[PDB]
Amino acid sequence: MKRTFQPSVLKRNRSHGFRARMATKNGRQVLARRRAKGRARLTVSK
Amino acid sequence: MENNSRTMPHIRRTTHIMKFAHRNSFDFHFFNAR
Amino acid sequence: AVVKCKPTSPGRRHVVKVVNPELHKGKPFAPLLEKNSKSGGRNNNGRITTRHIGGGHKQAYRIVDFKRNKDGIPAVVERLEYDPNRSANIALVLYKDGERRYILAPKGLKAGDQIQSGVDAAIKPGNTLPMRNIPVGSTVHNVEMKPGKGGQLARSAGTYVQIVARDGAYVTLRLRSGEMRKVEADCRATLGEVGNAEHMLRVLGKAGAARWRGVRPTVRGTAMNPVDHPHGGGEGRNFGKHPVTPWGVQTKGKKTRSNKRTDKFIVRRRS
RNA sequence: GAGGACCGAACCGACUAAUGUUGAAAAAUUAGCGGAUGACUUGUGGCUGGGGGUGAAAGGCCAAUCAAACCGGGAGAUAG
RNA sequence: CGCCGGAAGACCAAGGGUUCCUGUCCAACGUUAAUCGGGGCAGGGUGAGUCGACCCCUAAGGCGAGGCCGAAAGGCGUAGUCGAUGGGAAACAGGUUAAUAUUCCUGUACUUGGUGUUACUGCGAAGGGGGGACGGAGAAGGCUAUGUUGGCCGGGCGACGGUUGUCCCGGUUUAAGCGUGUAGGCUGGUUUUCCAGGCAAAUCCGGAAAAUCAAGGCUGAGGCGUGAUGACGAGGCACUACGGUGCUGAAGCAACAAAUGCCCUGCUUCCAGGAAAAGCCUCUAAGCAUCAGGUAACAUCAAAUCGUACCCCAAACCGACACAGGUGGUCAGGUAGAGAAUACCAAGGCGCUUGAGAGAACUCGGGUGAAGGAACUAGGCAAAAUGGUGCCGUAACUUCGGGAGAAGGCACGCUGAUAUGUAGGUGAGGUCCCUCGCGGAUGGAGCUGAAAUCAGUCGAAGAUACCAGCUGGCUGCAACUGUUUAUUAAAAACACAGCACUGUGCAAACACGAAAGUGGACGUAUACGGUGUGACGCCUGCCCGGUGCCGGAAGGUUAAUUG
RNA sequence: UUCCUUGUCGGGUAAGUUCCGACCUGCACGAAUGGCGUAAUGAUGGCCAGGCUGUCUCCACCCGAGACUCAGUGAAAUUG
RNA sequence: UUUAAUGUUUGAUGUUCUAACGUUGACCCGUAAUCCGGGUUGCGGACAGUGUCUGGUGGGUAGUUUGACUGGGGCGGUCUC
RNA sequence: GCCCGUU
């Protein structure tokens, strides 16, 4: 049957992409936490 | 949720398997000690 | 003309429709139209702030002249049109200089009739003039409350306002609800009643007719759980409570007017 | 040539029975069944955020989780 | 040999990302073996002015200089600026690779800009106006895609009786563009004068007046001509690594039937009254005036960048799997049929990645059954049965619509005749007229073709398969169509049209918001909110002591404050 | 909605705790948290009849897919 | 106890006024702008509205409580002398 | 003001 993950690249980048994270202060603290942990992928981008 | 299982990483909610009252074949007439 | 449908189906058995053949079968006047998109009852926070709103037919807004301040110039009535935005019908008028405007259509007004606003206009239905030059006892509609602001009272189909007294800089109006109210005498009004007075004689007949107007279904509070409404709960049909709103305020009797700056304009409240 | 009209495929749904129940499947299959121009159905995008939303109201649904989601923290809460 | 064929065929979007093609390998992966593979390794493969993105323009909505508001963080919003699922210039046919093609090649086209020359000329916007520009349902006419038959052309003379014919098989294809302007649709045309309107102006739009003409203009499928002395072409001939390659090539017409596609963003009708902005056309202001600019012809130049392989109802996407699940759009052949149902087929694609035997109980999915026919069981659960078209016929009750397909019954194949194929549909030639052409009248060849009657005939059975209502009687509840516990409950529950009470005079009540503000509503008491009841018919009685709400103000009691 | 209760009487059956009609002794109906009716409608609750049948008396045989044997691959719950 | 007179002075109610304050009335400008601000004017007007303090109401929302004994709990009874 | 009945 129909499952929960239905992929769409435009809706992916608009919801959790890099400019979406940089637009609010709470999204910028997500990127600071992921840089502090040292992650190889910061956002869900291309 | 069971979020770090190494034996079964594909599944997080598993009590539909072994808990008898959560299986799809559970009937409430099994609970007749009432 | 009030038409009863024949019961060829259970959704048609009770339908009563109002049919006016004098309306304009055709497209509306395009330079007086504007886009009017729907809300769903939601404000700029995105929350529902008025319930039971949603869906319905797409509608274009018609710019209706509520001010009637193009004075001294006469206007002929071209045709009567349908307006989906109000219960009243509207009329397209043509002024002598070539200007076209929508006005509210008053009772007994046909195509070819001659209207004129202004302080020197005549006392006949359709004309707009300040209430200091309307005789006491006349039947008016589209009444201003502030001078120059535009008509705000008695706009709905079949409604009117009686001028009961003029003493001073004020006139006393008998409103449609039965309220006596003081409005100042330099405010404008239009002579006559509003047309389409059998608008209240129609019967929708079925549930889908109310959904065509953008009215969503009402759930009774006594049909809910106590977490949802004060009336909720019960093992069977139980009420036991004093009737309240979804936010706990007593309905069925309790007055909610709280406005201390307009109380000096209200002579008598409705009863 | 009207209709929340009629019969009936696509399409939407889920009333009955059998199978399956370490399944082919964490809810299906087979045979029948209901709606099928409408209060219908569907694609793409958008809005509403947790004592909050949304609800033709079943405590239903809010990412296989809901009489208060999930993640991190107070936190080694407390446990006659 | 079997299966699908409104897909299990073909082409895409979304999503995936090399799974595509060629060579090579078989450890692991593949529910078995594997020489094979969507597996390992290596190499190759995606070619655009016209397709799409980007781009210009906006919807919902987002962000938002100043601004308004908020302990801080921030919230809302103006001017703006983003945002497609919508609007906006232009290409077709044929050929070719192992793998790309409307992109390469061949043939024939089209669009928008820049620059230059010549000829002529009031050009100019952040402004005005037009246009773009829009619903549901229904009906009819004209067409095409496509199909069938005939004619034509090429081939055949049959493994077993017959088959030189009223015989059999195959082919009979051709685009954009350019030219013509038809079926159909809409609308009167032209000139002059004037004006409280279109934020100023206007020769444009709107309004008024007068004269004159009986016609004009706009839109538009298809057809026809050209494109095309070409291309393609059944086959034949010549080589070959037997995969394929090279050359030549006949006919290439007519009739009938016919769409859910086109004319049609039309027409008719209804109420629930049906986006926006730019490109486009036009008007003028500031302004410039032998300038600049505008219009036409000709020449020349430019049209960048990114995507393009492959899968896409699936073994490549979402489901942990090569998982009986889920997934939007486009194309729509034949015979029978009302049909996109169903049965059998075409083009095309497949036999679902363990097999071989045996023929016990029992389980699953089916077939048939003596006599009886619900005796079974909580309960006719499940099965069995009914089933089509035409005609005859049809009760109580009723809100006069219904009930009703009530119930029940009769006919049904094939052959011949009526009639060498009828009624109807289509309509060539010939003739006549003019408006001389895509015209009208007459005319009927040819093609297509029901339904009925009479007579005969075969079978147990003619709606023969697939497909395809069981019917009737009494009663509870809910008026009805709808909605709901995704995964044990579809209902008598919820909703509903209708009814009533109550609040609400507009800066409305009320709701979301420390606020600003927003919804209610660009609505105004025939309106909006809340509550209860629930179509319709007949009705809805008595009680205000209690609790609540509304009204009252005399008296009693009574806060901060004052002292 | 009625505990006593399978109340009593009538109908239907050879036989009816259910059904239909009536009576009133309403444990404990009742008028818009509506009363009583009601044509049409319902995958709604109850009851009866005709047709039909492996539902049953009471099972028998047959066609396929497993079960069984051979070859290859090769699990699970549980367990002092 | 009871009143009037002169001199001096608050509270109440009422009536006008405008100048604080309101304006989701009109017009002009910033300005290519239904925001906002400034200006002119009209209507309200010391009212309304807001801050501090204060009485009432307040399951709208929150934090909690709701005993033990007991031939099982509940119900009943009991709890000290 | 009220003032029933009579096998």
Add this chain to the structure above:
RNA sequence: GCAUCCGUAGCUCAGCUGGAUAGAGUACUCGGCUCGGACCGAGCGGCGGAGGUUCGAAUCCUCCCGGAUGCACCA
């Protein structure tokens, strides 16, 4: 089965004056008005049983009987 409240004149109901004294309406009886009602005037008529406290009980105890009300739940 448990709990709570009631038994008073022929009938329906007061009286707990905290223990020292029983009443009302209606019925019935007698007399009058007119034949009978209605009406008027007078009268008559007794603490559910059985023990106990008490100087003394309808009243307070204990048991019994009768009549009502509520409860008898989770399995």
